[PDB]
Amino acid sequence: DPEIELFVKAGSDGESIGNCPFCQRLFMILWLKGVKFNVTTVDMTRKPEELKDLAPGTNPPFLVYNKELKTDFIKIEEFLEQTLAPPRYPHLSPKYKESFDVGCNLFAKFSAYIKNTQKEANKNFEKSLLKEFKRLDDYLNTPLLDEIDPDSAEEPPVSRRLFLDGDQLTLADCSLLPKLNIIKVAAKKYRDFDIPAEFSGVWRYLHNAYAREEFTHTCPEDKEIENTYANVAKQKS
C-alpha cells in the first residue's frame, strides 16, 4: 500500500474526531478502499502549532499520500478514486450523478432551516426540508435503470436496494451519509425534528447505512454536531 495520512478536524477536546462531514467523507472512502491509512486530528484552536508545516492554504481536511500534500475537498476524493483503482482496489464512483444531487439539495434545505432566526418562519423551512426528504424517499423507492431486485429480478415496481446507487456503498453515500447524520442529530436537538416514519425509503437506507461500520465508526460523537449549531440555531420569537 501507499503511505496515507488523513488530517481531519478535531472536536472540542482537540483530540477526538470533530464535526466535519467532508473529513468523514474521506475517512469513509479510505476505509471502503481497503487501504492501510492513518487518521490524525487537527486542533483548529491551536493553528500556529497544529498548522505545522505549511503552505497557508492548508486546512482540514487534507491528506498526505507518499509525502505529497493534497488539499481542497473534492480534489482529494478525485485523487483517491483515481489512484486507488482496480484491479487492486474497489471502484467507488456511482453510476448515476443523481445519486449525488439528491444529497446536496437536502443538506442545503436543512442548513437554511437550522440557521433561520425567525421562529415565525419555521413552518415554511420545515416544509422545505420535508419536501427534500420526500425527494430522497422517492429516489430511494424508485428502481434505478440498471436495477435487478434479488427476489423479482428486473424492472421491479418499487426499489429495495441497499444504498443510493445500488447495493454497494459508493462516493454518493460517502457524501450523503455524514450529512444525513448531521441533519438527524442537529434537527432533533434544535428543532425537535424527526425524519418521518412514513419515508420508508429514507429509513430503509438509514437502517442499512447505520449497520455499516465504515459509516457509523467514522461519525463524530453527537455532541460535536450539537456544538456546531449551538449559537446559530437560536431563534427570535
Q: Is 15 annotated as a binding residue?
A: yes
Those residues with Cβ within 8 angstroms of residue 71's Cβ, 6 or more apart along the chain or in another chain: 55, 57, 58, 59, 62
Judge whether 207 is annotated as a binding position: no
Dihedral sign (CA 219, 223, 227, 232): positive
The residues pairing with 41 across neighbouring beta strands, listed in sequence order, are: 8
Distance CA 147, CA 159 (A): 8
Smallest CA-to-CA distance from 184 within 168, 156, 206, 165 is with: 206
The neighbour count for residue 145, using CB atoms within 10 Å, is 7
Binding-site members are 15, 217
Binding-site members for glutathione are 15, 217
